[PDB]
Amino acid sequence: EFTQSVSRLQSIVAGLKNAPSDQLINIFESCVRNPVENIMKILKGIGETFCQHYTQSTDEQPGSHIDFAVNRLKLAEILYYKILETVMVQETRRLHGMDMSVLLEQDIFHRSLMACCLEIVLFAYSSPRTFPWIIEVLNLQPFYFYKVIEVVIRSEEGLSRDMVKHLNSIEEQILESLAWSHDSALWEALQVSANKVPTCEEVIFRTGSLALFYRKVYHLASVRLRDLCLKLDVSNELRRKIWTCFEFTLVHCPDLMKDRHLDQLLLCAFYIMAKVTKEERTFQEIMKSYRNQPQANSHVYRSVLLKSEERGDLIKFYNTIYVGRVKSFALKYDPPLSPFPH
Amino acid sequence: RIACEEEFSD
């Protein structure tokens, strides 16, 4: 009578409680600084905020009953403590017997595990509160949040293939937009690193939050480029040219991505480099072949930021913003090229 | 110049 989603959830959390297990309590008490009260405080605060926003209605979302909210919270708290256990049991420090006070006092990790847990609970019930509702309600930076998604996938083999697909999916929403927000902390991370964007070779072939974000951004872009390149029948050595233009846009004109979508910068490069090449392709061909990809939706080429505000079209954005800042680079290929991952 | 005069479908 329950959906495959809700049934998997129900069977993941069976026999488990909204509290730390005695195995976790022992790991907490092993640490110099016991994290249990900080962890319970974060959960109570996230708990109150989730049910306050769930209960009250907004134009966007009508508010639902507290009784459904409390159940959704209890299931997410049960997921939280079970997943925290598997993560902590399996950290190399635990396995070498070394104190885990530093790991367990990172507030950002606990808040973003609780929020993914809530996203799992809400997706499984096909909640109308589509991501990123939960991270906006909880004041969680995509740039910091997206890193727990990979851990959760690794730390709970009970998750359905559909759930891992949803979690990979929202990971890809953050890497294509969301983390390129004017208010995102990737801009602060870039500033503390002299505004030096990592290159594909420096991450794919240093280490830190900016590097593994770019790591992840590059490999999403890599996968998406091969797919437009195969659907458009274009070359495989031109492919390395538009990647080098894409890397140039990310490294030397990072601002172009502010309040924008990575696809917008990926397709604009494809047209430029192809037109600079004999391998000319045009936007309708590019847009129709992209229209097939799963994240491709109307808004990404019929609504593009121009000034911050006015919004237009992919071609208006290409000509008004993209060709001035990228034409000088593209003309060189009518030179060094960047290594394409895999 | 590098550019396009192509419109798009609705």
Tab-separated table of C-alpha atoms in Angstrom:
chain	number	residue	atom	x	y	z
A	1	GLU	CA	0.000	0.000	0.000
A	2	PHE	CA	3.118	2.246	0.428
A	3	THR	CA	5.250	3.491	-2.489
A	4	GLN	CA	8.577	1.823	-3.230
A	5	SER	CA	10.219	5.033	-1.879
A	6	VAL	CA	8.352	5.203	1.387
A	7	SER	CA	8.764	1.438	1.837
A	8	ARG	CA	12.557	1.572	1.425
A	9	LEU	CA	12.688	4.496	3.882
A	10	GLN	CA	10.392	2.675	6.333
A	11	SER	CA	12.692	-0.424	6.163
A	12	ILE	CA	15.970	1.660	6.385
A	13	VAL	CA	14.799	3.238	9.695
A	14	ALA	CA	13.219	0.159	11.240
A	15	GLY	CA	14.361	-0.677	14.753
A	16	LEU	CA	16.087	2.673	14.973
A	17	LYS	CA	15.373	5.776	17.054
A	18	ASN	CA	15.457	9.606	16.819
A	19	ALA	CA	18.385	9.367	19.204
A	20	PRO	CA	22.052	8.447	19.163
A	21	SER	CA	22.696	4.703	19.456
A	22	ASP	CA	24.898	3.408	22.231
A	23	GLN	CA	27.564	2.666	19.577
A	24	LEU	CA	27.553	6.384	18.562
A	25	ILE	CA	27.388	7.557	22.214
A	26	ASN	CA	30.578	5.574	22.917
A	27	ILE	CA	32.331	7.215	19.889
A	28	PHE	CA	31.189	10.613	21.178
A	29	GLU	CA	32.476	9.853	24.715
A	30	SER	CA	35.813	8.656	23.246
A	31	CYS	CA	36.371	12.204	22.036
A	32	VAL	CA	38.094	14.896	24.190
A	33	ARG	CA	35.172	17.156	23.445
A	34	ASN	CA	31.886	15.140	23.401
A	35	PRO	CA	29.723	16.387	20.518
A	36	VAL	CA	26.325	14.988	21.619
A	37	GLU	CA	24.861	18.229	23.034
A	38	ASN	CA	26.007	20.340	20.075
A	39	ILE	CA	24.480	17.664	17.744
A	40	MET	CA	21.154	17.677	19.649
A	41	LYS	CA	21.047	21.500	19.663
A	42	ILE	CA	21.570	21.674	15.862
A	43	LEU	CA	18.794	19.094	15.363
A	44	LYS	CA	16.371	20.934	17.657
A	45	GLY	CA	17.064	24.226	15.855
A	46	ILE	CA	16.815	22.635	12.387
A	47	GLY	CA	13.719	20.822	13.725
A	48	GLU	CA	11.983	24.059	14.853
A	49	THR	CA	12.884	25.943	11.628
A	50	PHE	CA	11.679	23.067	9.380
A	51	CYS	CA	8.351	22.792	11.096
A	52	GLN	CA	7.869	26.616	11.273
A	53	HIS	CA	8.381	26.912	7.464
A	54	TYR	CA	6.422	23.716	6.664
A	55	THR	CA	3.469	24.922	8.780
A	56	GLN	CA	3.224	28.417	7.504
A	57	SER	CA	1.920	29.165	4.092
A	58	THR	CA	3.590	31.259	1.437
A	59	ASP	CA	2.406	32.207	-2.078
A	60	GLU	CA	4.903	29.583	-3.379
A	61	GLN	CA	3.898	26.814	-1.028
A	62	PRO	CA	0.684	26.314	0.960
A	63	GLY	CA	1.496	25.313	4.585
A	64	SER	CA	0.818	21.748	5.772
A	65	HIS	CA	-0.112	20.228	9.174
A	66	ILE	CA	2.408	20.000	12.056
A	67	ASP	CA	1.579	16.292	12.506
A	68	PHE	CA	3.008	15.446	9.036
A	69	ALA	CA	5.994	17.746	9.731
A	70	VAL	CA	6.818	16.019	13.064
A	71	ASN	CA	6.672	12.584	11.360
A	72	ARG	CA	8.891	13.782	8.513
A	73	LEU	CA	11.341	15.215	11.100
A	74	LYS	CA	11.425	12.008	13.183
A	75	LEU	CA	12.236	9.931	10.101
A	76	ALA	CA	14.914	12.410	9.050
A	77	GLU	CA	16.396	12.403	12.647
A	78	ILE	CA	16.443	8.546	12.570
A	79	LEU	CA	18.259	8.756	9.168
A	80	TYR	CA	20.618	11.410	10.624
A	81	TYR	CA	21.784	9.289	13.595
A	82	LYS	CA	22.075	6.033	11.576
A	83	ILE	CA	24.104	7.802	8.796
A	84	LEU	CA	26.247	9.696	11.359
A	85	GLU	CA	27.108	6.290	12.972
A	86	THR	CA	28.151	4.649	9.583
A	87	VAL	CA	30.218	7.762	8.690
A	88	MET	CA	31.995	7.906	12.127
A	89	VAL	CA	32.532	4.089	12.425
A	90	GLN	CA	34.220	4.157	8.940
A	91	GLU	CA	36.416	7.266	9.301
A	92	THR	CA	40.089	6.368	9.171
A	93	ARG	CA	40.657	8.239	12.489
A	94	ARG	CA	38.137	5.919	14.250
A	95	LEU	CA	39.904	2.887	12.642
A	96	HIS	CA	43.368	4.075	13.889
A	97	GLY	CA	41.928	4.851	17.387
A	98	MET	CA	42.602	8.590	17.153
A	99	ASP	CA	40.353	11.297	18.688
A	100	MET	CA	37.543	12.597	16.454
A	101	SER	CA	36.678	15.788	18.375
A	102	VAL	CA	37.573	18.026	15.337
A	103	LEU	CA	35.485	16.049	12.756
A	104	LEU	CA	32.464	15.858	15.126
A	105	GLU	CA	32.527	19.595	16.022
A	106	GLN	CA	32.004	20.794	12.366
A	107	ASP	CA	28.491	22.374	12.614
A	108	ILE	CA	28.329	22.688	8.772
A	109	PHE	CA	28.592	18.862	8.381
A	110	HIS	CA	25.805	18.055	10.877
A	111	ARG	CA	23.435	20.752	9.451
A	112	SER	CA	23.938	19.593	5.914
A	113	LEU	CA	23.509	15.831	6.786
A	114	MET	CA	20.233	16.657	8.585
A	115	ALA	CA	19.103	18.656	5.530
A	116	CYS	CA	19.925	15.893	3.001
A	117	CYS	CA	18.148	13.462	5.390
A	118	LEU	CA	15.101	15.781	5.244
A	119	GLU	CA	15.431	16.008	1.426
A	120	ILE	CA	15.467	12.185	1.308
A	121	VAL	CA	12.366	12.060	3.541
A	122	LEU	CA	10.592	14.810	1.455
A	123	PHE	CA	11.524	13.336	-2.002
A	124	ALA	CA	10.326	9.831	-0.892
A	125	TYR	CA	6.852	11.288	-0.116
A	126	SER	CA	6.998	13.272	-3.474
A	127	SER	CA	6.717	16.469	-1.326
A	128	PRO	CA	5.872	19.684	-3.240
A	129	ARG	CA	8.853	21.319	-1.382
A	130	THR	CA	11.225	20.799	-4.292
A	131	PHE	CA	14.917	21.247	-3.586
A	132	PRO	CA	16.293	23.717	-2.829
A	133	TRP	CA	13.373	24.467	-0.453
A	134	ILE	CA	15.124	22.669	2.550
A	135	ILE	CA	18.561	24.422	2.236
A	136	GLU	CA	16.884	27.861	1.739
A	137	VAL	CA	14.624	27.240	4.785
A	138	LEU	CA	17.703	26.161	6.860
A	139	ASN	CA	20.063	28.950	5.642
A	140	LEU	CA	22.512	26.412	4.159
A	141	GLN	CA	25.078	27.429	1.452
A	142	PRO	CA	24.878	25.097	-1.607
A	143	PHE	CA	28.682	25.440	-1.839
A	144	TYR	CA	29.106	23.814	1.628
A	145	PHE	CA	25.980	21.618	1.484
A	146	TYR	CA	26.681	19.712	-1.836
A	147	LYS	CA	29.738	17.873	-0.305
A	148	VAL	CA	27.598	15.800	2.179
A	149	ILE	CA	25.527	14.380	-0.753
A	150	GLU	CA	28.460	12.172	-1.939
A	151	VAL	CA	29.106	10.950	1.676
A	152	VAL	CA	25.391	9.986	2.240
A	153	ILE	CA	25.383	7.951	-1.097
A	154	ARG	CA	28.567	6.179	0.141
A	155	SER	CA	27.312	5.888	3.813
A	156	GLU	CA	23.879	4.197	3.300
A	157	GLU	CA	23.806	1.342	0.764
A	158	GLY	CA	20.069	0.957	1.755
A	159	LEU	CA	19.247	3.844	-0.609
A	160	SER	CA	17.175	3.101	-3.717
A	161	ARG	CA	18.685	3.712	-7.174
A	162	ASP	CA	16.018	6.403	-7.605
A	163	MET	CA	17.093	8.151	-4.347
A	164	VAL	CA	20.800	8.177	-5.409
A	165	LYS	CA	19.641	9.604	-8.780
A	166	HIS	CA	17.736	12.383	-6.954
A	167	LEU	CA	20.728	13.092	-4.709
A	168	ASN	CA	23.111	13.163	-7.711
A	169	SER	CA	20.491	15.365	-9.416
A	170	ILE	CA	20.390	18.069	-6.685
A	171	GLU	CA	24.246	17.830	-6.488
A	172	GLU	CA	24.186	18.777	-10.219
A	173	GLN	CA	21.721	21.669	-9.560
A	174	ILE	CA	24.329	23.213	-7.167
A	175	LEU	CA	27.207	22.775	-9.613
A	176	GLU	CA	25.307	24.347	-12.548
A	177	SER	CA	23.656	27.254	-10.722
A	178	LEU	CA	22.961	27.775	-7.001
A	179	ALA	CA	26.632	27.770	-6.047
A	180	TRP	CA	27.277	30.499	-8.632
A	181	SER	CA	24.818	32.755	-6.724
A	182	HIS	CA	25.931	36.342	-5.874
A	183	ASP	CA	25.421	35.276	-2.241
A	184	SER	CA	27.376	31.981	-2.560
A	185	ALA	CA	30.453	31.334	-0.463
A	186	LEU	CA	32.413	30.082	-3.444
A	187	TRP	CA	33.083	33.806	-4.132
A	188	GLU	CA	34.519	34.139	-0.599
A	189	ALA	CA	36.583	30.985	-1.149
A	190	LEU	CA	37.887	32.389	-4.420
A	191	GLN	CA	38.819	35.682	-2.673
A	192	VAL	CA	40.899	33.935	0.036
A	193	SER	CA	42.704	32.204	-2.855
A	194	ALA	CA	43.593	35.459	-4.698
A	195	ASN	CA	40.606	35.004	-7.061
A	196	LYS	CA	42.549	32.189	-8.789
A	197	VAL	CA	40.078	29.680	-10.214
A	198	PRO	CA	41.467	26.146	-10.353
A	199	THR	CA	42.318	24.808	-13.861
A	200	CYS	CA	41.268	21.328	-15.084
A	201	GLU	CA	44.836	20.030	-14.834
A	202	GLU	CA	45.328	21.412	-11.349
A	203	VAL	CA	42.213	19.556	-9.991
A	204	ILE	CA	41.535	16.605	-12.410
A	205	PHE	CA	45.259	15.705	-12.792
A	206	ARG	CA	45.475	21.879	-5.470
A	207	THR	CA	43.181	20.237	-2.831
A	208	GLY	CA	40.502	22.015	-0.741
A	209	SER	CA	36.920	23.282	-1.109
A	210	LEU	CA	37.526	25.331	-4.308
A	211	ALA	CA	39.469	22.471	-5.898
A	212	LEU	CA	37.025	19.732	-5.317
A	213	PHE	CA	34.125	22.046	-6.381
A	214	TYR	CA	35.959	22.735	-9.648
A	215	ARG	CA	36.809	19.010	-9.792
A	216	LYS	CA	33.116	18.250	-9.715
A	217	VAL	CA	32.127	21.196	-12.009
A	218	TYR	CA	34.644	20.163	-14.643
A	219	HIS	CA	33.534	16.546	-14.678
A	220	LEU	CA	29.849	17.505	-15.031
A	221	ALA	CA	30.769	19.861	-17.877
A	222	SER	CA	33.005	17.179	-19.404
A	223	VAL	CA	30.181	14.621	-19.423
A	224	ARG	CA	27.699	17.137	-20.860
A	225	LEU	CA	30.097	18.276	-23.651
A	226	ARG	CA	30.759	14.732	-24.897
A	227	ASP	CA	26.989	14.319	-25.120
A	228	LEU	CA	26.263	17.466	-27.160
A	229	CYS	CA	29.372	16.591	-29.271
A	230	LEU	CA	27.980	13.124	-30.055
A	231	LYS	CA	24.421	14.342	-30.765
A	232	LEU	CA	25.740	17.107	-33.013
A	233	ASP	CA	28.210	14.722	-34.826
A	234	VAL	CA	31.057	17.250	-34.421
A	235	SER	CA	34.751	16.265	-34.163
A	236	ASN	CA	36.589	14.847	-31.164
A	237	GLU	CA	39.581	17.155	-31.509
A	238	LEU	CA	37.413	20.309	-31.859
A	239	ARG	CA	35.935	19.012	-28.591
A	240	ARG	CA	39.175	19.879	-26.823
A	241	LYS	CA	38.965	23.477	-28.252
A	242	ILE	CA	35.547	24.264	-26.822
A	243	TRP	CA	36.648	22.777	-23.447
A	244	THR	CA	39.651	25.125	-23.515
A	245	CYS	CA	37.277	28.077	-24.258
A	246	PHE	CA	35.009	26.846	-21.422
A	247	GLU	CA	37.989	26.648	-19.051
A	248	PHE	CA	38.970	30.184	-20.124
A	249	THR	CA	35.476	31.421	-19.323
A	250	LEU	CA	35.644	29.810	-15.847
A	251	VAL	CA	39.266	30.775	-15.056
A	252	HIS	CA	39.636	34.233	-16.665
A	253	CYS	CA	36.067	35.446	-16.708
A	254	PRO	CA	34.661	33.823	-13.573
A	255	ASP	CA	32.090	36.651	-13.105
A	256	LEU	CA	30.201	35.510	-16.184
A	257	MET	CA	28.931	32.559	-14.102
A	258	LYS	CA	27.528	34.797	-11.371
A	259	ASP	CA	23.719	34.282	-11.204
A	260	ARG	CA	24.000	32.168	-14.368
A	261	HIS	CA	23.920	28.472	-15.468
A	262	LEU	CA	26.991	26.429	-16.537
A	263	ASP	CA	25.093	25.179	-19.619
A	264	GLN	CA	24.699	28.822	-20.796
A	265	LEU	CA	28.549	29.095	-20.742
A	266	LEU	CA	29.020	25.605	-22.305
A	267	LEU	CA	26.819	26.132	-25.349
A	268	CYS	CA	28.096	29.688	-25.974
A	269	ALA	CA	31.603	28.238	-26.190
A	270	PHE	CA	30.411	25.489	-28.573
A	271	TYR	CA	29.029	27.937	-31.098
A	272	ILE	CA	32.032	30.301	-30.925
A	273	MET	CA	34.682	27.643	-31.272
A	274	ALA	CA	32.764	25.823	-33.983
A	275	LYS	CA	32.261	29.065	-35.941
A	276	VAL	CA	35.959	29.921	-35.507
A	277	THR	CA	36.512	26.296	-36.744
A	278	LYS	CA	35.312	25.019	-40.143
A	279	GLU	CA	33.030	22.822	-38.054
A	280	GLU	CA	30.224	25.473	-37.950
A	281	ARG	CA	27.041	24.447	-35.995
A	282	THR	CA	24.250	26.834	-35.139
A	283	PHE	CA	22.294	27.621	-31.997
A	284	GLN	CA	19.019	25.931	-33.083
A	285	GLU	CA	20.942	22.745	-33.742
A	286	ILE	CA	22.834	23.148	-30.417
A	287	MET	CA	19.664	24.049	-28.394
A	288	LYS	CA	17.560	21.195	-29.940
A	289	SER	CA	20.308	18.585	-29.313
A	290	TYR	CA	20.714	19.941	-25.739
A	291	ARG	CA	16.921	19.973	-25.308
A	292	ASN	CA	17.263	16.213	-25.006
A	293	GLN	CA	19.645	16.180	-21.896
A	294	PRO	CA	17.873	15.633	-18.517
A	295	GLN	CA	18.657	19.048	-16.764
A	296	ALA	CA	17.864	20.992	-20.023
A	297	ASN	CA	14.621	23.004	-19.531
A	298	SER	CA	13.069	26.004	-21.338
A	299	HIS	CA	14.453	28.681	-18.887
A	300	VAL	CA	18.184	28.021	-19.522
A	301	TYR	CA	18.163	29.538	-23.117
A	302	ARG	CA	14.902	31.664	-23.028
A	303	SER	CA	15.834	33.421	-19.707
A	304	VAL	CA	19.515	34.437	-19.198
A	305	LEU	CA	20.955	37.224	-16.947
A	306	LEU	CA	22.168	40.338	-18.941
A	307	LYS	CA	22.704	43.144	-16.297
A	308	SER	CA	22.149	43.099	-12.445
A	309	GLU	CA	17.900	43.503	-13.685
A	310	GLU	CA	17.032	42.545	-17.304
A	311	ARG	CA	16.670	38.985	-18.757
A	312	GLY	CA	16.722	37.849	-22.411
A	313	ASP	CA	17.735	34.809	-24.592
A	314	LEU	CA	20.849	32.612	-25.235
A	315	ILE	CA	21.754	34.504	-28.486
A	316	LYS	CA	21.170	37.986	-26.934
A	317	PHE	CA	23.516	36.876	-24.046
A	318	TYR	CA	26.040	35.458	-26.553
A	319	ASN	CA	26.295	38.678	-28.562
A	320	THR	CA	25.804	41.219	-25.778
A	321	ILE	CA	28.105	39.656	-23.113
A	322	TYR	CA	29.878	36.528	-24.281
A	323	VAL	CA	31.417	37.509	-27.597
A	324	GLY	CA	33.126	40.662	-26.316
A	325	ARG	CA	34.845	38.890	-23.451
A	326	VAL	CA	35.616	35.617	-25.305
A	327	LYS	CA	36.183	36.629	-28.999
A	328	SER	CA	39.902	37.533	-28.457
A	329	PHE	CA	40.541	34.003	-27.057
A	330	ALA	CA	38.516	32.188	-29.753
A	331	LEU	CA	40.342	33.913	-32.682
A	332	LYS	CA	43.701	32.321	-31.611
A	333	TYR	CA	42.268	28.954	-32.827
A	334	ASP	CA	41.603	30.106	-36.448
A	335	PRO	CA	48.042	27.370	-29.212
A	336	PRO	CA	47.856	25.394	-25.918
A	337	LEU	CA	44.791	23.253	-25.145
A	338	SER	CA	43.431	21.800	-21.850
A	339	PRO	CA	43.329	18.116	-20.931
A	340	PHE	CA	39.751	16.664	-21.154
A	341	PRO	CA	39.012	14.290	-18.199
A	342	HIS	CA	38.474	10.442	-18.306
B	1	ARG	CA	32.414	39.698	-36.045
B	2	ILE	CA	31.804	36.447	-34.101
B	3	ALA	CA	28.035	36.473	-33.557
B	4	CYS	CA	24.671	35.110	-34.689
B	5	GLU	CA	21.502	36.583	-36.200
B	6	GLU	CA	19.560	33.355	-35.469
B	7	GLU	CA	16.254	33.670	-33.533
B	8	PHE	CA	14.639	30.642	-31.841
B	9	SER	CA	11.361	28.645	-31.781
B	10	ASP	CA	8.679	29.359	-29.116
